[PDB]
Every structure is written in structure tokens, then in C-alpha cells.
Design a protein around this ligand. Structure first.
Ligand SMILES: [Cl-]
Ligand SMILES: [Zn+2]
Ligand SMILES: [Zn+2]
Ligand SMILES: [Zn+2]
Ligand SMILES: [Zn+2]
Lengths: 68, 63
């Protein structure tokens, strides 16, 4: 029963799809977003009309996310 | 270069995790918590980092 912690300890782990690139492709649906994939992989999900893998909501857009 | 900055606390309040992504155009700057970022959007203040107008706040999760 893995509940995510308060702070995003896994933010530095690689994209869960390609397993090499940083998590910078935020999958946005409504006012929430799941950030577990890189921009390239997340764009491919939307291009191929696939839903967000985590919550299964339709993907409205991918936001290229920076962490300044 | 992986986002180690993402694990630091909200730049504005220093006590909450960075889950308020500030969207502008097709990009987002994630450095503030949702509460602080929403206060900025409600007051039509710009992104703290790049000072561009805020399109929306995305409540962000790291699953
Ligand atoms: Cl300001
Ligand atoms: Zn990827
Ligand atoms: Zn989702
Ligand atoms: Zn804050
Ligand atoms: Zn910005």
C-alpha cells in the first residue's frame, strides 16, 4: 500500500516509461497533474491518445516542467 | 541533471512541498507549494521566477 510521502523523494528518479530521462513532462488533466515521465514520453502518450497511466484521466496537455 | 530542486521546500513559505506548478505557455515552473502559487494566481501576480503571467496552477503529484 504505497502512499507517496509529503516531499517528492522520487522526483529525481528517471521517467517510469523510458527509465533514463528526468521527470519533466507533467501530464495535466483539469487542475491536477501526474509527473512521472519525461517530456518526450509524455508527449507520445498524448499524441497516441492514451490516458494518464496513473489515474486514467484523458490527457489535456503536457507541460514541460522546470525546477528552478 | 535530475530535479533535486524539486525536493527542497516551497521557495515562498519554506515549510511545504513543491506541488504548485506555475504554468505559462507550454512550460511550468515548479518551485512553490499549491497554496502559495494559488495566492499568486488569484491576485494576478506573475510567476515568481520568470515574472511571466500565470496561465494556471497545476496541483502536481509524483506517483
Ligand atoms: Cl510579483
Ligand atoms: Zn521517458
Ligand atoms: Zn493522472
Ligand atoms: Zn508555500
Ligand atoms: Zn515562470
Amino acid at each position: 500500500e504505497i502512499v507517496e510521502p509529503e516531499f517528492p523523494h522520487n522526483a529525481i528518479e528517471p521517467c517510469v516509461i523510458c527509465q533514463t530521462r528526468p521527470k519533466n513532462g507533467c501530464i495535466v488533466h483539469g487542475k491536477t497533474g501526474h509527473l512521472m515521465a519525461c517530456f518526450t514520453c509524455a508527449k507520445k502518450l498524448k499524441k497516441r491518445n492514451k490516458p494518464c497511466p496513473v489515474c486514467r484521466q484523458p490527457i489535456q496537455m503536457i507541460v514541460l516542467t522546470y525546477f528552478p
